Amino acid sequence: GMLETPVTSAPIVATYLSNLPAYRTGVAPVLRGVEIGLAHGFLLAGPFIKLGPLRNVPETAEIAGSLSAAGLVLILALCLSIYGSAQFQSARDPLFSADGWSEFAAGFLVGGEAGVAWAYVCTQ
Amino acid sequence: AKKVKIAVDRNPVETSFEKWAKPGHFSRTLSKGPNTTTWIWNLHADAHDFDSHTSDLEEISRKVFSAHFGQLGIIFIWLSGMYFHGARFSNYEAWLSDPTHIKPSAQVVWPIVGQEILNGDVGGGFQGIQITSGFFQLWRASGITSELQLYTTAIGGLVMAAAMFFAGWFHYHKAAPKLEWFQNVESMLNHHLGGLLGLGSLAWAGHQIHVSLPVNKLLDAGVDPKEIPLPHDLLLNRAIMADLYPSFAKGIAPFFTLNWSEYSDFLTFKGGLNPVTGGLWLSDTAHHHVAIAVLFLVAGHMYRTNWGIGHSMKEILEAHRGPFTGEGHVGLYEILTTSWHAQLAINLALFGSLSIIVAHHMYAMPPYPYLATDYGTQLSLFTHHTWIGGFCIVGAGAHAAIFMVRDYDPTNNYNNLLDRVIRHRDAIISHLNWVCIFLGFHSFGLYIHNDTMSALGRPQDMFSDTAIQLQPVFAQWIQNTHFLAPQLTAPNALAATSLTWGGDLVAVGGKVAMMPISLGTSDFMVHHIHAFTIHVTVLILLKGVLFARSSRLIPDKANLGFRFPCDGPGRGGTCQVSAWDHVFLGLFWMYNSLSIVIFHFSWKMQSDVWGTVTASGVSHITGGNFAQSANTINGWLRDFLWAQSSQVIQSYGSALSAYGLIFLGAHFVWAFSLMFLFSGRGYWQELIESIVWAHNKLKVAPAIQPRALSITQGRAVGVAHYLLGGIATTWSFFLARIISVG
Amino acid sequence: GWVTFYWHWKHLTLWQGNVAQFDESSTYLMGWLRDYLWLNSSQLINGYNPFGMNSLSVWAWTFLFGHLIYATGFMFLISWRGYWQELIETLVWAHEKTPLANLVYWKDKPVALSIVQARLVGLAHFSVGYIFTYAAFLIASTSGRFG
Amino acid sequence: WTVPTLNPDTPSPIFGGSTGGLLRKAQTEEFYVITWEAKKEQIFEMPTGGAAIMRQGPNLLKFGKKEQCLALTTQLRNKFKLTPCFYRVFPDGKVQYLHPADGVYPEKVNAGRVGANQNMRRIGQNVNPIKVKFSGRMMSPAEI
């Protein structure tokens, strides 16, 4: 069969993945979308603020960077939505279905924008 | 316990010109003679492919052994010519008197069709082509002071060349070693470690201690070369040597009584560069070769041959067995004693990597007198030995794939290191694939980021020392550690091994020989370009070796062979799947990667090291513009290629006008090659049909049917012309530039 | 290219009044490389430099932009399909075995470009880089000199 | 001769495994199974890369595409003089048998086979492309 390896087949690694929102079955797709969106949205603000074109402005740097992070989350939400449209047109987990993914994309937008807003509040 | 012994066969082959008159005799396919022009190319392509002429390993080994004598004989003719031309067509004797003002020259052209203009004014009342091979500096270091000494070496070189060709004939036609002789790897390593490298180093130490050191000590003192004692007078008269080095007054008793400190006057550990000549101390070099001689002579007593003591190489390999690697190194000993290609793959890899290491160490620690201040020699030697190393490494991939197709046998390799590597090749190539993509974005993308920010009028947004900074902190730490080594970690060394680490510059004849090299943001960016282009070359070559036998596209690629064009247009198209084609593609990337290496060296040296010393300070050739300009692609185009190519394009009408012609001619050959790379033989075979019709119409059609080159030969002809044109273009550009200003 | 180089160089010398340069330097190929391509690139490649930029920085940027598209075309013309199809097969393997990414999947099986497609794609890059490089040089050399 | 029936419980060669094996296609579209009898335990080369030991008696392997199965078949026949046969297996559980289609390898002529895609003319006697134009689809003159 496939080449066995500790990275591919280890107990500690398997348990960690099984607890991630993507693999945690039994949770509504919308809730998983919010949990995933919040984590990525919070991180997405970092690089824009520190290395953006308006990084050296004292107060505008925080606003401009976070506002660009919010924009990228919006674009990503569109990518999630159209992916579901193309992939699911006609199985065990509700997420991998036309109904499930549409809820998942909506949750990501709500969670992602909340994370970007929450990141801004931390700064000011 | 097969004894190690000499074993030959008497008169294996007859010496006759009969087969010289029967082209293709070596191969069954070509022995029948030509019917199409394809036969002619096949004759030269398969001439030295011994492994395919016969399936007998003994017959293959005997041809390899004698073909090596022919290579040695050719080098001696070449070496003899270099020494002879130094004696008869050079200004070496004048150069010894005024090394800092006279340009070395050892080639003279005849006065025909107006080519005598190439005999430039080089100094010493001599006209000739300036040479960048560094032979004058080598001869001075060894102690050569007259053209008679050069002449005798050339005559000795021809005698050695005759001996080498006799040996090849003798050991193929008269007394050919048997296969069991060739397979004494333990014995060969013992002799080559302690005998070739070991005694060779000791013998050269004898020359340096007795000839080079006394002669160069007086030359540096200003003594006229003609008034220096001859090397044999130094050897016969211990009184003379005692004057230069008092340690000689005690003879060899200190060596045998272990009072080795008595020889401190000529066996030194100074470090640094000789201030008078700008090269390494020869007393340091002598202690180096004496130390190296002992290390290798000890190394030559490690393997067991006939007297029990020693190691068995098979036993070492089979003992190194771990939990993560299955059987381990089992089966490698049989692979490496029955496959010439496997041996060649290893040796080319390390021999090529060694040639690249030589280039870095020789420029940073100039080992010859007046080598450093001769910028043309420094640039040429570094660039020459980088190109040699590059080609050898690509060959290592080529002959690793040949082993994989021809000499690989699954029965002998089951669950060993070799087998397990093949069983996760997708994991290796997929990861190496991602690393190359990552390195391409985060190294070349930075240049594109800088070029766009600069064009938009946003210099503060660029990656540079005056902007967002990328300091090679790790390299800078190592430079400082080596600079302070003599204080605490190498107490008995007087100076740092190189002046690149730090300290003060050494100037010879008003020119900088070596000074500290600073690493900044531009150096950070260029180095990660090197890592990118090297990693890609590994990807192409390693992919060819791992997928030589099969892939998910061609499950039976081994049966097709090592060198085939494709498996047809099916499966979407299978052009260039053979392992030979991975060498073909790997050659382009090796050329791409080494071109940046020699551009990096050329611009960094001119900008930051080379220059003229004056009262105020050091003025460099390009005035320190590397730091601010080499962070954009536009900077390289304008400041390096466009500005420095001024010398080559203005060469007409001068002694350097030859470089101008070759600069254009090289551009031509390179573009000519794209005809073979961008086309296919289907078009050309149809074109020849119409051309053949015209000859048939005139009863002048050849008997050997014209054929368009094969698919593989089109790719081989393309890459050979592409490399020759590209490399020759840089060669002309470098020499016309550095000779003109350097 | 030969036609437009000939038209451009013969007119630049006329527009500067020094027709003698073309008459003397046009009879050998070093004159073209030296006195036409190298001599007239001085202003183009200074559109932006470590000291600043001017109105020619767009043509300087487009000049290198052309060289890049041209060189990218060599990849599609020199290296052919079989190499790339086998490389893509390890990328398909890597995606399927990667956790947290094999949740996403493709609908069209990735494959290398076809034999015929890569010739067109390589020729398109070759032509575009060809055109954009000379357009930037033609306009920049002529406009900066007089305009 | 009758069509053999596949036995899913047939033992498989001694193989550690590799990364060149089946992919997600096998679980969604199809895969291929090759079976044969071995006179003695021997080492052979896997078309997916590596070496495997064939057990004495029946052996069974699974491959991702047909060409891989027929590549192993050539190796077994030419070197080991064996007589392997392989199937096409679908995810729904259906099994399709092929090679040898009728029990005799195609290289050997056998009565009962019906010629297919045979044109009783030469290549030079095909019609011109103009005469098969606007036939509803791109059609070569050889097709008609």
Added chain:
Amino acid sequence: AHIVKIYDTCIGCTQCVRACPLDVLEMVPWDGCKASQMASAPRTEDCVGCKRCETACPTDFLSVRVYLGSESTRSMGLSY
């Protein structure tokens, strides 16, 4: 699926059948040649278009011809 056609110049050498790496071709009885056998292409849905059969045909011009046509998972030689 590709198109594979056998023409009446076949001499029944069987080289095309041996060359084929996907068992697309086979030999059938015939009376139009000395060998009394002709090549057949009953399983063209498995053809990949390698044209190894055309490489192996001795007759001039070829007696077996492959016309690349519509692509699919099998004809594109994919294992994924």
Added chain:
Amino acid sequence: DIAGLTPCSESKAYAKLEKKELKTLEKRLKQYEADSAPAVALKATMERTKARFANYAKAGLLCGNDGLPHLIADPGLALKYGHAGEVFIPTFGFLYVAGYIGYVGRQYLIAVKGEAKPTDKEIIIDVPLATKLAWQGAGWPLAAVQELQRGTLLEKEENITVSPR
């Protein structure tokens, strides 16, 4: 003169060009000795330079505003004004040699087609035959024309293979 050109012997720019080349050589000369090897070589070059400029003027060439010789290719203009030696005469000089080489090779190729193994006579040249044909080629224009009139120069259209059409 012709096309606005002037004889090089009467051209001011042509004369100035000679001084420039001699001046360059003289400048290098004064850094050597009177009769040293480099000095002798430079003096030899200057003699050839002076001879070259005298020969081209004596030949009656035409110089342009650049002060460099230009050649006349029209046969009518060449013979009209005595420029036949520039292009016209060398035209028939080359064709004789070019036809010589081609005719000799064609004779050899026909000669070996009658042999048992023509291919082995092409990689391994039959030197005795080649030398025989090399000397007889001096009369190729006469032999070439007679073949044309007798109709044995060209193959028949029916004996030449062609592709389907």
